[PDB]
Amino acid sequence: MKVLVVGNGGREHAIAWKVAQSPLVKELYVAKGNAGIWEIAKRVDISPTDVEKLAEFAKNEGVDFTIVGPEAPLVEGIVDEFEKRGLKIFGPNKEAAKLEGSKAFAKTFMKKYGIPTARYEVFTDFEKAKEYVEKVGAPIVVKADGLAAGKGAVVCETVEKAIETLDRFLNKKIFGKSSERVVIEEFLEGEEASYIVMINGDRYVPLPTSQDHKRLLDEDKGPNTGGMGAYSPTPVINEEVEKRIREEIVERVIKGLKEEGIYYRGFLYAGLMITKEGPKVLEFNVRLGDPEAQPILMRVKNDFLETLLNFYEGKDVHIKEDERYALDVVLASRGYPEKPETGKIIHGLDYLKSMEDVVVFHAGTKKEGNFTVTSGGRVLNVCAYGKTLKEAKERAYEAIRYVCFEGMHYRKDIGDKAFKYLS
Numbered sequence: 001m002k003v004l005v006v007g008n009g010g011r012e013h014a015i016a017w018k019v020a021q022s023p024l025v026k027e028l029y030v031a032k033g034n035a036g037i038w039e040i041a042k043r044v045d046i047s048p049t050d051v052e053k054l055a056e057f058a059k060n061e062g063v064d065f066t067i068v069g070p071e072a073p074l075v076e077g078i079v080d081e082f083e084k085r086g087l088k089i090f091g092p093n094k095e096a097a098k099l100e101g102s103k104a105f106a107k108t109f110m111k112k113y114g115i116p117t118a119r120y121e122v123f124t125d126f127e128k129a130k131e132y133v134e135k136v137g138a139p140i141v142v143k144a145d146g147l148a149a150g151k152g153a154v155v156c157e158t159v160e161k162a163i164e165t166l167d168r169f170l171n172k173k174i175f176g177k178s179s180e181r182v183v184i185e186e187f188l189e190g191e192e193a194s195y196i197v198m199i200n201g202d203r204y205v206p207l208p209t210s211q212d213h214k215r216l217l218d219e220d221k222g223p224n225t226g227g228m229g230a231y232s233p234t235p236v237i238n239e240e241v242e243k244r245i246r247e248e249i250v251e252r253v254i255k256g257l258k259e260e261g262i263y264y265r266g267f268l269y270a271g272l273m274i275t276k277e278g279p280k281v282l283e284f285n286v287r288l289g290d291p292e293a294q295p296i297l298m299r300v301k302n303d304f305l306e307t308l309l310n311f312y313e314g315k316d317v318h319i320k321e322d323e324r325y326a327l328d329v330v331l332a333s334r335g336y337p338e339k340p341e342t343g344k345i346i347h348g349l350d351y352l353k354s355m356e357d358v359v360v361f362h363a364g365t366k367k368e369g370n371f372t373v374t375s376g377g378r379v380l381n382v383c384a385y386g387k388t389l390k391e392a393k394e395r396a397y398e399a400i401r402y403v404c405f406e407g408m409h410y411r412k413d414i415g416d417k418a419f420k421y422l423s
């Protein structure tokens with residue numbers, strides 16, 4: 001069968017990599033993808049957000065199954081475009097994608113269905129929002145309503161930073177309609193963690209747990225980014241935390257969707273903050289997280305293509321998790337998360353291909369002749385398996401010693417928050 005993966009980053013390389021292990025796929029396509037994915041998939045020169053054009057391609061090319069990686073295409077209704085042409089695609093339709101597409105929608109939904117989350121208030125008026133934050137004081141979190149390419153959610157340590165943020169969002173409208181409405185919520189403290197499940201109507205199946213590191217620099221400093229590294233599983237989500245997540249979050253989302261009459265099929269990644277009060281939703285992501293997908297998929301033993309195909313049509317499935325830990329360190333471009341420098345030659349990729357228990361997922365890489373060059377903010381995902389987390393971390397960092405590109409930056413503390421939970 002023909003399978004199409006939509007997206008150009010590390011999450012998509014992980015997806016394609018897993019799909020390519022299945023005896024079912026005969027032709028694998030990626031739109032657009034990157035240098036790393038092109039070693040195992042045919043390049044489709046269509047941007048992931050050109051949803052109508054992608055649907056037309058899949059139809060004409062006869063794609064049997066499509067898996068969507070990033071949020072933009074989903075929020076834009078790529079699934080609806082595919083359904084319109086009678087195509088099978090894994091991901092939520094435009095209405096269901098609102099759980100990620102609109103913070104206001106998500107927060108209102110969670111309040112209505114009793115889902116644990118940060119207390120909040122919604123605003124469309126700068127003066128009103130300003131007066132509000134001055135009254136509540138800091139720390140506080142200010143978020144744009146719609147997608148803002150990783151710049152919509154800002155933690156403000158001071159009231160001044162909050163008003164400055166509101167100014168850019170509401171007065172300047174830096175993100176257009178996306179920033180014309182904002183959500184201001186309480187700053188939550190605790191340990192961050194990621195819980196991802198696959199949902200199809202009333203049924204859901206959990207995927208490996210994980211913990212990401214959002215800040216650019218070691219000891220959680222510097223600006224927020226799309227994610228600088230993640231590992232699986234994370235002890236932050238023990239047996240009982242997982243029980244609370246499934247019952248107070250996942251199952252309540254399912255109940256809410258049912259009451260709203262909204263059909264949901266696809267991945268649901270809940271960005272969490274595990275507080276002393278219990279797990280709370282920072283935000284919903286209607287797709288796999290990046291880089292969370294990398295270590296997660298590294299630990300899914302079974303044929304993931306078969307699993308997705310069966311789950312897609314309502315068949316029961318059972319995820320078999322690798323007993324080994326999986327850790328991923330992101331190598332980013334100088335400038336990231338602000339304008340990244342690009343066009344730098346990446347050396348050492350061949351060395352890593354021969355390293356055992358090492359896996360590299362490309363993110364933002366392209367070709368320049370026979371050379372592989374940087375083309376985006378996040379460039380490489382240097383991953384490694386390990387019987388223990390310590391082993392996984394050390395192997396990943398050992399691998400980093402052999403890869404290189406000008407201006408490369410990466411955190412050295414990926415996974416450090418987990419050790420206080422282990423022995």
Ligand SMILES: Nc1ncnc2c1ncn2[C@@H]1O[C@H](COP(=O)(O)OP(=O)(O)OP(=O)(O)O)[C@@H](O)[C@H]1O
Nearest residue numbers: 118141148149150151152153186187188214282283
């Ligand atoms: N209520 C909160 N309390 C504490 N930290 C928060 C809160 N909300 C968000 N954060 C921090 O911001 C991060 C989210 O960054 P993220 O970019 O994923 O926001 P987003 O919802 O995806 O919208 P955008 O991508 O445009 O910024 C969280 O992982 C967390 O570290």
